[PDB]
Every structure is written in C-alpha cells, then in structure tokens.
Amino acid sequence: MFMINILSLIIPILLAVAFLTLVERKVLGYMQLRKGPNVVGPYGLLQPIADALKLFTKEPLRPATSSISMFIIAPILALSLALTMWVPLPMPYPLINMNLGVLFMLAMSSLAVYSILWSGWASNSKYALIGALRAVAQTISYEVTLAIILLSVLLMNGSYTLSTLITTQEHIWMIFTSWPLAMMWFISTLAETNRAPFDLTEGESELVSGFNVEYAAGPFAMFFMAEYANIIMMNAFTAILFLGASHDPHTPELYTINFVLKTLALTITFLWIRASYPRFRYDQLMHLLWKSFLPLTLALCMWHISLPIMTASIPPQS
Amino acid sequence: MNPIIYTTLIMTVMSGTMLVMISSHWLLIWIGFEMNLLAMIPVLMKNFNPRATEAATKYFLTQATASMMLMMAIIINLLYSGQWTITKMFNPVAMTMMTMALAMKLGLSPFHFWVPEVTQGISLQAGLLLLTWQKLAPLSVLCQISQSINPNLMLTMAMLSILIGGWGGLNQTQLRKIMAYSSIAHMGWMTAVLPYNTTMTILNLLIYITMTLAMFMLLIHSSATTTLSLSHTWNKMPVITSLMMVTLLSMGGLPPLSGFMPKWMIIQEMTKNESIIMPTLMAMTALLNLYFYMRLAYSSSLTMFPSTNNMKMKWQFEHTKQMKLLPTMIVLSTLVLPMTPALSSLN
Amino acid sequence: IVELPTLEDLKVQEVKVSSSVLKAAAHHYGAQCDKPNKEFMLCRWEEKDPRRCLEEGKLVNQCALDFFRQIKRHCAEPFTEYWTCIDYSGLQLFRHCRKQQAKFDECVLDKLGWVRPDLGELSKVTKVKTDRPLPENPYHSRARPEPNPEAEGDLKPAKHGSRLFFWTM
Amino acid sequence: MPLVYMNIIMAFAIALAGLLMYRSHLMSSLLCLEGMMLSLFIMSTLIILNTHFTLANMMPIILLVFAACEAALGLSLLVMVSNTYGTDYVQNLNLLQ
Amino acid sequence: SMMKWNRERRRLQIEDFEARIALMPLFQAEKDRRVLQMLRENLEEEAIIMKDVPDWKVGESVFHTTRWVTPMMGELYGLRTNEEILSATYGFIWYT
Amino acid sequence: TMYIAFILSTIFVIGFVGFSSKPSPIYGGLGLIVSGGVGCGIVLNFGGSFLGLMVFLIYLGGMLVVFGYTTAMATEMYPEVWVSNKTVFGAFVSGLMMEFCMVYYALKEEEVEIIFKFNGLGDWVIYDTGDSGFFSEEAMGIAALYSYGTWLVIVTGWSLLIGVVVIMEITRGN
Amino acid sequence: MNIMLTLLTNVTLASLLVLIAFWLPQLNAYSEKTSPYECGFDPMGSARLPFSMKFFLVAITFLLFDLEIALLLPLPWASQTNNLKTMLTMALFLLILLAASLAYEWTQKGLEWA
Amino acid sequence: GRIASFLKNAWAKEPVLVASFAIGGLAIILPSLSPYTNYAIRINRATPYNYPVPLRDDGNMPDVPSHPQDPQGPSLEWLKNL
Amino acid sequence: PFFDVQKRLGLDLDRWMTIQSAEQPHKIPGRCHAFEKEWIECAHGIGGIRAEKECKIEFDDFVECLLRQKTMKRLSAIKRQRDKLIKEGKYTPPPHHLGKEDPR
C-alpha cells in the first residue's frame, strides 16, 4: 500500500500549488489595496480550478518552427522533478529515509533548470533563446553559493540525513546559531526559485514572459505549476532546516500542525517580497553574488568548519 | 602574460613532470600527466596567433585522448590484480593499451602526425620546450614498466618511428617542421632499446636533449625559420651558421661526433640479444635521417645563398640578451665522445 | 572436499527474544554474562575458522539463556514496561524512554541486586585467560621462499675498469 | 568477470570510437570525451565498491575532478576556434599530417 | 547552547555504542552457525544434483588454500527462492 | 532476479550509442543526461550512494549545463536530429546491433569470447556480506581524504587553481 | 522497490497531463497561427549566434568552483576522524585556494560577468 | 599608523569584504589557542564503531582490566563531567 | 627514472594509498586481505623476477579472491545442471518454508 502513500503525497501538493496561486493573487492583491480575486468564489476559492480548466480546455498549438520532441519533453521534466524533490522530506516522518537526501535535494534542484534551457532552446524564438540563456546564468551562479552555505550549515547537525536534523534542533533552533547563512540561504532560495527581485527568467516587461512564451496552454500550465512546486518546496526545506520544533513521537501529527505553519510563514513572505522590490538586472544580479555574497559564504564557511574543533562540539552522527 | 605568471606555469610544468618522476602510485602518475597538460597548453598560446590556436587544439585533443586511454588501461590492470604500485602489469589486453597511450605521449608513429604540425604552430621557445621537457615524463614511466612490455609491439613502433621519422624529413623547407621529424626519429632510437636495457635509453635521451637545446638555442640566436631565412645568416654573424653545421652533423651521428655515442651503444646492446637484423635496418635508415640535415647544411653554412641588401644596416647591431646556457650545450653535444664510459654512472 | 560439521552438531536452541527487547536489557547483559563471551570472541579472532570456536559459540547461547532465566522470575513487568516503551521508536533510541529504566534498573538493583555499568565502561578492552593453545599458523600458509643472498666482501678496484671497447682505463 | 563490467567496458569502447569517427564541428568531440570519462569513472567506482578496498573510495571523485577539469579547459580552446569561424573541424590551417 | 546539547548527545551516542558492542558476540555466533548450516545444506543438495555427472568432485574448494574464506554471498544462496535473494543482497539498499 | 542493474547497464550503453553518434552537441547532451541518471542508478545499486549522487550532481548538474552554453556559441542553423543523416542514423543502428549481439550472448549464457572472458550470470553473485557498525564503508572511506590523504588534496588544490589561471591566460589573450 | 516506483508514478502522471493537454481541445491549427512569436512583426531571421566571451569567462569559473565544492562535501564526515590536526589544515586549505582562485579572478578583471 | 587609516576607508567602501577577511582569518588563527581542541580530538578516541577485541592473559600486564569493569582501563568520567 | 625521493626522505606521502591492506581507517578489512597478506609476505628479497614463479600459487588464490572467477564457472555449471534435473528432480522443500527462519 506504499503506492497509495505516494498518491497521498502527490495529490494534496498539486492542490496546494493551485491554492497557492490563489493566495498569491490574494495577498499580493491586498498589498496593492485592491482586493484580489473574489467574485467567483464566494471568497475566490473556486477560482484556481476554473483557471486550470480554462487552460487545459484552451488549444495548445504545436509551433511550426519548434522541434517537437524537446518542446514536449521539457514540461514533463519540470513537473517531474518538481514533485520528485518532495519525497525525502521529513514531515515528521520522511516518505523515504535517504541516508543523504539533502544532497539529493540539491541534485533535483540542479537538474531543474536544465529544463529551462531546453524550454528556451526548442522554443526557437529570439526571446526564448536570450531569456533562457540569461536564466541559466543566474541559476547556476546561485547554485554554487547555494550548495556551499548549505554545507556549512550542515557541518553541525552531524550528517546529511534529514530526520537527524530534527534531533539536532530539539531546543535552540539552528537559526540563532548561524543566521547570516540563513540569510544567504534565504536569498539563494529567492533566486534559484526565480522569484521577486531576482525575476529574470520570466523576464516580464523586460522580455515579455521570457522563456515561457511560446508554450501555450497545458505545457505552460506545467511550467507555471512546477514553478510553484519549487517555491513551496524550498520554503518547506528552509523551514525544517532552520527552524526546529518540539516533537513527541506518540503524537507526530502535532508536529506537522506546527510545521505547515512555520513553512507557510515563509512562503507568504516571498509574496510580500514580490510586492516590494524592483528587479535587479542581469549584471547586478550576478555582481552581488560573485562579488559580495560569496566571500562571506567562504569566511563563514571556514568559521563553521572551525567552531566544532575549538568548541570541542563535534556532532554525533557517524 | 606577465613573467610572474608565466614562470608559475612553467614551474608547475616542471612540477607536473617531477611528480611523475617521484610517485610510485599509478594514480599520482596519471595526475602527473594530467596536471602537466593543463599547464602545457597556455604556454603555447603566448603571443597568440590565428594559427597558434589550432596548434594548441591539435595538441590538447591528442594528449587528452591519450590520457584517457591510459587511465582506462590502469583501471583494467587494477581489475585483474587489485594493485596500484607500478611494477609488472597483469593483463596483456591492458598492457598493450598502456603502451599505446604512452606511444601517443611520445608522439611515436603511427600516432605521430600531430607532432610535426604542432611544432609549426608555436615559437621556437615553446617549441624547444615541447620537444624536450615533454619527452621526459612518458619515458619516465616507460623506464619503470620496461619489465613487462611485449617487445614486439614496442619494436614495431620503434622502427616505424624511424622510417616515418625519415621520409617525412626529406620533404620540408621551414626548419621547425624538420626539427619535428628529427625528434620523431630519435624517439624511435630511444624506445627501440627500451625493452632490452633502459640505461642506454636514458643515455640517448640525455644526448638528444642536449642536441635539440643546441639547435633551438641557435635558431633563437638567429631568429631563422624558413630555410631561406636561415640562408642569409652566413654574412651576419658567420659563426653561428658555421656552428649549425656541426651540431647538425652531431644529429647525423658522424662517428667522431658525440651524436654517434647513442647509436653505437644501442647497436651494442641489441647485439647481445642477437636480434642482429633489426639494428642493421635501423642504422641504415638513420642515414636517410642524416641526409636532410645535410641538405639543410647546404642552404646555410657551406654555401652562400644570395644576400638581400637590406641586411647591411643590420650589420651595425650586435645581438643581445645572451643565452648563458648555450655554449656548454654545444660543446657537450659534440666533443664528448671519448667520455662514453662515464655512461655507467647512470648504472 | 572441504571439511564441514554435521548439520546436527551445530544445532542449538536459539535465543529467540526480539531485538528491541534484547537491546532493552543488553546493557546489563554485557555486564553480567562475560567470561564465556570474551573467551568466545578472543577464540574467534585467534584462529579465524568459525568451526574451531563453534562450541564456545554454543556455550555463549546457553549462558545468555541462563541470564534471561534469571530475569523472568524477578523483574519482568517493570521490564516489559521498559522495552515496550523502547520498541515503539524505530530508531530504538535510548533517549526516548529512559524514565522506565528507573523502574527496571531499580527493581533489578534491589530485587536481584546488581549495578548497571556506566556509559564509559564496556568499551574498554579486557584481559582474558585461556588454556587452549594460540594457533601455530592461523593462515596455515606455506613456506617462505629462500631469500637471495645479501653476500658482500669489500671493493677491490675494477680489474681493468670500463672494459667496454677500446678504453683502457 | 561479471557481465555488467563487460558492458561498461564496451560503453567505453563506443565512447572512444565515437570520439575518433570524429566529424564536423568538434564540440561533439568534447562531449564524447566526457562520456569516455564518465565510463571510466563508473567502471572504477564499481570496483572500489566491490572489494571493500576503502581508501580507494577517495579516488573516483578525485579522478572525476581532473578529468572534468581538462574538459573544462577544452571548451575554452573551442571558444577561440569558434571565435574566428563559427566552429567546424573541417577548417584547419596547419599542413603535413 | 548548541555546544551543551551536542556534547550531551555525544554521550548518549557513546553509551549506545556500548549497547551494541555488548549485543554483538552472540550475533556473531548466530550468523556463524547459520552460515555453516546453509553451506552444509547446499552441499548436500549438490550431492544430489551433481551426482549424475560422472566426473565431479563434490564440494571441492577452488583454492589451494586450506584456510576458511567466508563464502561470497552468491554461492551461499545458490538455489534459494528469488525472493530470498532479494532479501539477501539488495534488501538493505532497496529498504527505505 | 530483476537483473535491474544489468538492464540499467544496457540502457547505459545505448545511451552511449545515441551519444557517441554525433548529431548536434545538444542532443548528445541529452545522451549524457540519460546515461548520467542511468549511471548514478547503477552505482547506487552497490550502495556507493554518495558517489552516484556526486556524478548525478557534479557532472550532470554542472557539465551538460555549460555545454548548454557552448551550443549557444556554436549551434549553426538547422542542427541535425539523429534521423537527419544517413551516417548518423546509420551509426546509431550500428551501435544497436552490436550491443544487442552482446545481450544475445547473455542469452547464450556462455562466457564471452570477445576481447577477454565475461563470466556471465547475474550481478548479485559477486556480492559479499556488507556487515558493519553504524557507518557505511563509503562514509569514512571518503572522509579519509582529508586526514589520511593530504597529498592528493594538495595537488588537486594546486591543479584547479592554476587551471583557473589557464582559463585566464587563454581568454584574456583576445 | 521504493524510489523507482515514485519516479514512475510521477513521470506517468506528468505524461498523462500532457496527453490530456493535446488530445482534448480538438480544434484547428493552421499556418501563421503556428508561426513563431516576435512581438507582432515577423522575425528577421531564425536564432543564430548570441556570442559572448562574457558567458564562458565566468561560467567556466562556475564549473571550476563546482568541482571544488565536490571536494568540500566529504567534510562533515571527515570531521569525526581521529586526528583533526592532520585534517584541519586541509579543511582550511582548499577553502583558501577556492578564495584564492576567486581572488585571482577578482582583480585581473576577468570577472566582468554580465 | 597610516595603515590603520585606510581601514576606515575600506570599511567605508567595501564592508562586506572587510567582515569577510575579518572572520575569515580569525577562524584560522584562533583554533590553536583553544584548550578544548585537545579534548575535541580526545572525544573521538573514546567512541568505538569497531569492536574492542580482547587480549589473552599473559602474566599480569596488568593495566588491562580483566572484566567485569576492573578499574584498570582508561577513565572516561572526565568526559561525563563535560 | 623512478626517483624514490619519498623513500629516502621517508615522507611516505604516497605509499599509504597503495595495497589492499596497509592500515585503513577504522581498521576496515579489505575483502581479500588474507590472500594478499600471505602473498606479500612471500614477496621480498625474491624481488620481482623469481617472484612470478615461486609465489604464483598465492597470487592465484588471490586472483580467485578478487574475481571469484572459478567459483562462478562452477556455480554456473551447477545451476545449468539443475535444469536438466528439473523434470527428473524436485529439489528441496524447505527453501520454501524450512527452519531457516526458525534458524536464527
């Protein structure tokens, strides 16, 4: 019956990305004073399914110039990995007890953007190619610092296994120990997921919906959907990794009741970022990283390498 | 590229070979070549030409595939004996490939085709360094795996290197390509005797390096390149053409000269092994190798090709930036013949 | 052609307590059962062949049986109250329960009367007397082939030296 | 030797023959070379996993490094050749094979 | 705080290592007898199956060596049901 | 059994069949993606999980992306699909028949005559007991790299560093 | 097994969404509707060569850092080795070179990104 | 003297980088100073993934305890007090 | 020129990584440590040449330790033999439900 467990992991999350869309227009609406979607609800609630139906019902043309195979395979990979990254996530009990699933989170995250590269390559359009390319730039440029700071915050939990990361937070929370790395992790999740100030992949006014343009109905729904999969997912990831909680094994549910709060509390923040800052432009986007984030990530890294020895505080896990 | 970086590259090449000459573990040898490569390519790219670029493309492409086959054959060796120490290899299908990989690294024929071309693409500095220092490391490992070599496979490339090192030498004008066929020919003589007795190899190696240092220092001293360009030099600084003659003859191995010492020890060693026919063919072809050294001598010192007028002003201006190491590199590469026995110092 | 023990001669009634229950009390089990135990493993690491030490491998089984027989008549309800607490976690972590261990360890330290070893104690290597010979050559192996002579005298000067070709001296 | 190893070795042989059949723009060759690299990696790691020859668990990753490293270099040369042409192997300045 | 908690967890860890380290030896005994058992049994099944072959020393060690080897867990499951083999080798890795 | 590791080896090899054939670098990049995931899976089956995830991360998550940059610099109009030429497609089929002959040899169950003998049967057979304490062999096995193997760390550091220098001294020249 | 099963269910799920995406609207594709978008007016030419040294000049540096972090990964486990003073220098060492490499790029003006 | 002055300058100019060098070097110089480091390595001597194979008796020796827990082997409660 | 400076200076910086045994972290045994140990103890003053004669048997057993080649050809011969008996013989009932689960 493991299969029904998996299905039980995949349906609720898709429902969550739909209602995530709706919340996005809501909050992001009230920042603007204007109310968000409302009339169709009554509280808007029925909207996202009407939305998705509007999409899938609508004709999804196969472009004349595009090669078709890449053009179809890319969205598939997008939702694929967007969902697959969810499996080893301790809530509290992981669906899979990977010995080193964090590293796996990095693996999925790193194959993610490759789909963007195909998405813009097979699309054949000028905007497609240029936007896709700059997209891959910002992405990788952030995955390096990404993985380093994640390393440095992992020296002290003990090991790459995720469940232990609960155990190592049975009191103080990791964040008080190494918040600056939490900042850089936050922003790196704010760019790797391609979000608000780090907005370039969509391009928007800069490049009229970026790479995603030539995709029409359903595949567009897939990239859109998968994008929100990554946003909520890196949010949850940050939540478990920098914000611990009380956990009685006899009542696991209690913990989850807490956890969705602590993660939702993050996701909303991205939206409340979106309502706040103009995008960086491709120079500065990479400037602040290579010039400014990174060296601190290193100095902090040696520092965190060095605390366990000076403090004689080396974490247990073999 | 400022000297402070250039010197770090060249020193890390020296290190990248020294490492091969030190480590016993195989992985450090493949690391030795691998580090050697990365540090070898950029130095070919100084000055930078539309030509030089594709020169480096050739060199990298062949060295990379060679290093690949080598690592594969190491891994196969490990699979069938679980070792990393150099020693004997324990699986002929692997061993022949380690021989092939090294055969590319020396540039022995029929793998040789890259070497005459690459030499064409770079200045005589980077050229000389390529034809001497790069010849150390792969030989440095062949001496260590002389114990189990499959002599047939070695002598075949060892001969064919001499024939190809001959016939492709009669044909060219511009000197650098000729120096390439000279070296590609001497490597046949080094790698020939290797199965039988490594000390003769290392002797021949020393003579070869001394020789090609003599030549390339001379070509540098006159900045000649194409044969005709060399032809003018007899009037300006007659000595150095009058000295290219000799060093060329020492390439040719006319017997009073030092360059005869290699061949004449080699012929000894192989003759103890019987194998009497092979050195006869080899020594006969070495003649063919000599002949284009002679023709090149005719362009230069023995006869005066017509001078161009513009040369006259150049007579007022002495050459500068003297290269200290040169005179000794001439003299050792010539007069040393009644000092063969000292070869036993190499044990 | 390899020698083997008969299918029967090895046979011994198994310990059949579950692993969680086993672990709950094993911390004492090391403290009490011991001499046969270390005799056993020392016997194993000596000659490597299992068959050689298989008998001691029986003796340890029965020793452990006697250990639990000593257990069940006394502490049990506190004991079950303990390992039931522990088996509930799939990490088998000691930290999750602990308090019951107060019950169990006290009921034993009184009613059957002997102390639990401290955390820094079992790990240390133990001296062990034994009567059976340490094996001649555990690897069996073979002869070590005769080494080449390291013969030497002193160096008189070469008879004519550098005798190769025309050189005289 | 178990058949799987034979299969990976054969993947090497194809990863070489592909490099040497060698055609049109050379970027394909840097690919084929990297594929070759990957086959050697996997063939090594399976072995170090086999015999529990634990120290050598360090090698494959180190192997990977330099190998990837040279390939990382290789693209740069391609750039230069791409810089003057828009790459193709079909165009070579040098004479005498 | 991280120092305190981390050290303490190191203590409960090392104590857990004493726990396992106390459990170990009899497991060694069990795996021992079980191995020799399976080896005997499979050897007997060899005596039945290969007996038809005119020329077949039965159970011969491939080695010259007298010494025990601890068999590769391939021959040890030379005839077992496929499910038992799935339990045998991949069973850890495929386990969650 | 499942022979799953072996069939993964087969998909691996055809991954190199479509890859070693040379039909625009981008599709070859796909070829190394497929062969990449298949690779990490295969090495995962012996449980050297950390390494399989190195390659699944460091290689495919690194390389083939930068190749997804070279093609932006190379491309040329009308890149060829595998089907787009007789020699390319001919080559792909040329790989398929050979590897299929190998699988047929696996059906033969006889030791392979090619090059050198392949002992045959299932992969599982070579496995031995993996018994250990609360640590995988791999973990401390690679952890050894720092404390117990400083020399390699030195030469790798030096090498990568001066490799960056080389990239400089090539690109700056223009 | 476990993981392969979830991979299969995910990919089959997505592929199912694709098939219900195409074989459903059931309407009229035709030329010019299917022509590539170019903000109205037709393209001046199919996508070619957006060449830039400023791509690889940094992207290669990405690749050579990613190889480095690949060596950083063993660290958490290496931290528990019996002899840290033998280790610790190296733990710092690579990071220095990482930084050093960057530093060298930092000021040879090789890091113009963009 | 004056060299201190351009720290005010750099701190005015590139603070990020300044903090970076600060902790980045301090993390290297500091560790040798800390006494706990000697304990730190010591802890990892204490924990035994591998089994402690017993040694045969051979005339006293005698610091090796012959178990049960003879007070002859290493003390470890020093660690317990931490 | 196998300079062996690492030996003369005693640095040993390379030597450790060599060989199946030779001290490994947490003293984890090689899978084929024993045949290897014997085979190397056989190998010293004999040096290289005579060593490929006299120590051949040891290296052989070490080979089979590495590849398990011969035991696989045998085991394959048995399993292929069993098919011939598959109709003539029913093999063993317990494999299916014997005391092997009682066995621990």
From Swiss-Prot, chain A:
Assembly notes: Core subunit of respiratory chain NADH dehydrogenase (Complex I) which is composed of 45 different subunits.
GO biological process: aerobic respiration; mitochondrial electron transport, NADH to ubiquinone; mitochondrial respiratory chain complex I assembly
Gene Ontology annotations for the cellular component aspect, listed alphabetically: mitochondrial inner membrane; respiratory chain complex I
Signal peptide bounds: none
Protein name in UniProt: NADH-ubiquinone oxidoreductase chain 1
Membrane topology label: Multi-pass membrane protein
Catalytic function, reaction form: a ubiquinone + NADH + 5 H(+)(in) = a ubiquinol + NAD(+) + 4 H(+)(out)
Organism field: Sus scrofa (Pig)
Keyword Transcription in annotation: no
Domain of life from the UniProt record: Eukaryota
S-S bridge residues: none
HAMAP family: NDH1_NuoH
Keywords: Electron transport, Membrane, Mitochondrion, Mitochondrion inner membrane, NAD, Respiratory chain, Translocase, Transmembrane, Transmembrane helix, Transport, Ubiquinone
Curated annotation (Swiss-Prot), chain D:
Subcellular location(s) of the protein: Mitochondrion inner membrane
InterPro entries associated with the record: NADH_UbQ_OxRdtase_chain4L/K (IPR001133), NUOK/Mnh_C1-like (IPR039428)
Any one GO biological process: ATP synthesis coupled electron transport
Keywords: Electron transport, Membrane, Mitochondrion, Mitochondrion inner membrane, NAD, Respiratory chain, Translocase, Transmembrane, Transmembrane helix, Transport, Ubiquinone
Reaction catalyzed: a ubiquinone + NADH + 5 H(+)(in) = a ubiquinol + NAD(+) + 4 H(+)(out)
Chief localisation class: mitochondrion
Primary enzyme class: translocase
Record carries keyword Transmembrane: yes
Single Gene Ontology MF annotation: NADH dehydrogenase (ubiquinone) activity
GO cellular component: a single term: respiratory chain complex I
Gene3D superfamilies assigned to the protein according to its UniProt record, in alphabetical order: 1.10.287.3510
Membrane topology: Multi-pass membrane protein
Transmembrane segments: 1-21, 29-49, 61-81
EC number: 7.1.1.2
Quaternary structure (record): Core subunit of respiratory chain NADH dehydrogenase (Complex I) which is composed of 45 different subunits.
Function (record text): Core subunit of the mitochondrial membrane respiratory chain NADH dehydrogenase (Complex I) which catalyzes electron transfer from NADH through the respiratory chain, using ubiquinone as an electron acceptor. Part of the enzyme membrane arm which is embedded in the lipid bilayer and involved in proton translocation.
Entry-linked PANTHER family: NADH-UBIQUINONE OXIDOREDUCTASE CHAIN 4L (PTHR11434:SF0), NADH-UBIQUINONE OXIDOREDUCTASE SUBUNIT ND4L (PTHR11434)
Similarity section: Belongs to the complex I subunit 4L family.
Protein name per Swiss-Prot or TrEMBL: NADH-ubiquinone oxidoreductase chain 4L
Organism of this sequence: Sus scrofa
UniProtKB/Swiss-Prot annotation, chain F:
Gene Ontology MF terms in the entry: NADH dehydrogenase (ubiquinone) activity
Assigned GO CC terms: mitochondrial inner membrane; mitochondrion; respiratory chain complex I
An individual GO BP term: mitochondrial respiratory chain complex I assembly
Main localisation: mitochondrion
Reaction(s) the record says it catalyses: a ubiquinone + NADH + 5 H(+)(in) = a ubiquinol + NAD(+) + 4 H(+)(out)
Top-level class of the enzyme under EC nomenclature: translocase
Keyword Transcription attached: no
Coiled-coil annotated spans: none
InterPro entries linked to this entry: ComplexI_Subunit6 (IPR050269), NADH_UbQ/plastoQ_OxRdtase_su6 (IPR001457), Nuo/plastoQ_OxRdtase_6_NuoJ (IPR042106)
E.C. designation(s): 7.1.1.2
Membrane topology summary: Multi-pass membrane protein
Pfam name, any one: Oxidored_q3
Subcellular location: Mitochondrion inner membrane
Keywords: Electron transport, Membrane, Mitochondrion, Mitochondrion inner membrane, NAD, Respiratory chain, Translocase, Transmembrane, Transmembrane helix, Transport, Ubiquinone
Segments passing through the bilayer: 1-20, 24-44, 46-66, 87-107, 148-168
Complex formation: Core subunit of respiratory chain NADH dehydrogenase (Complex I) which is composed of 45 different subunits.
Job description of the protein: Core subunit of the mitochondrial membrane respiratory chain NADH dehydrogenase (Complex I) which catalyzes electron transfer from NADH through the respiratory chain, using ubiquinone as an electron acceptor. Essential for the catalytic activity and assembly of complex I.
Similarity-based family: Belongs to the complex I subunit 6 family.
Protein name: NADH-ubiquinone oxidoreductase chain 6
Organism lineage string: Eukaryota, Metazoa, Chordata, Craniata, Vertebrata
Curated annotation (Swiss-Prot), chain G:
Record keywords, A-Z: Electron transport, Membrane, Mitochondrion, Mitochondrion inner membrane, NAD, Respiratory chain, Translocase, Transmembrane, Transmembrane helix, Transport, Ubiquinone
Membrane topology designation: Multi-pass membrane protein
Pfam families associated with the record: Oxidored_q4 (PF00507)
GO biological process, one term: mitochondrial electron transport, NADH to ubiquinone
Gene Ontology CC: mitochondrial inner membrane; respiratory chain complex I
Record localization: Mitochondrion inner membrane
GO-annotated molecular function: NADH dehydrogenase (ubiquinone) activity
Keyword NAD recorded: yes
Reactions the enzyme catalyzes: a ubiquinone + NADH + 5 H(+)(in) = a ubiquinol + NAD(+) + 4 H(+)(out)
Record-linked InterPro entries: NADH_UbQ/plastoQ_OxRdtase_su3 (IPR000440), NDAH_ubi_oxred_su3_sf (IPR038430)
EC number: 7.1.1.2
Root EC class: translocase
The keyword Transmembrane helix is annotated on this UniProt entry: yes
Membrane-spanning ranges: 3-23, 55-75, 86-106
Known role: Core subunit of the mitochondrial membrane respiratory chain NADH dehydrogenase (Complex I) which catalyzes electron transfer from NADH through the respiratory chain, using ubiquinone as an electron acceptor. Essential for the catalytic activity of complex I.
Family membership noted in the UniProt record: Belongs to the complex I subunit 3 family.
Subunit structure: Core subunit of respiratory chain NADH dehydrogenase (Complex I) which is composed of 45 different subunits. Interacts with TMEM186. Interacts with TMEM242.
Protein known as: NADH-ubiquinone oxidoreductase chain 3
Lineage: Eukaryota, Metazoa, Chordata, Craniata, Vertebrata
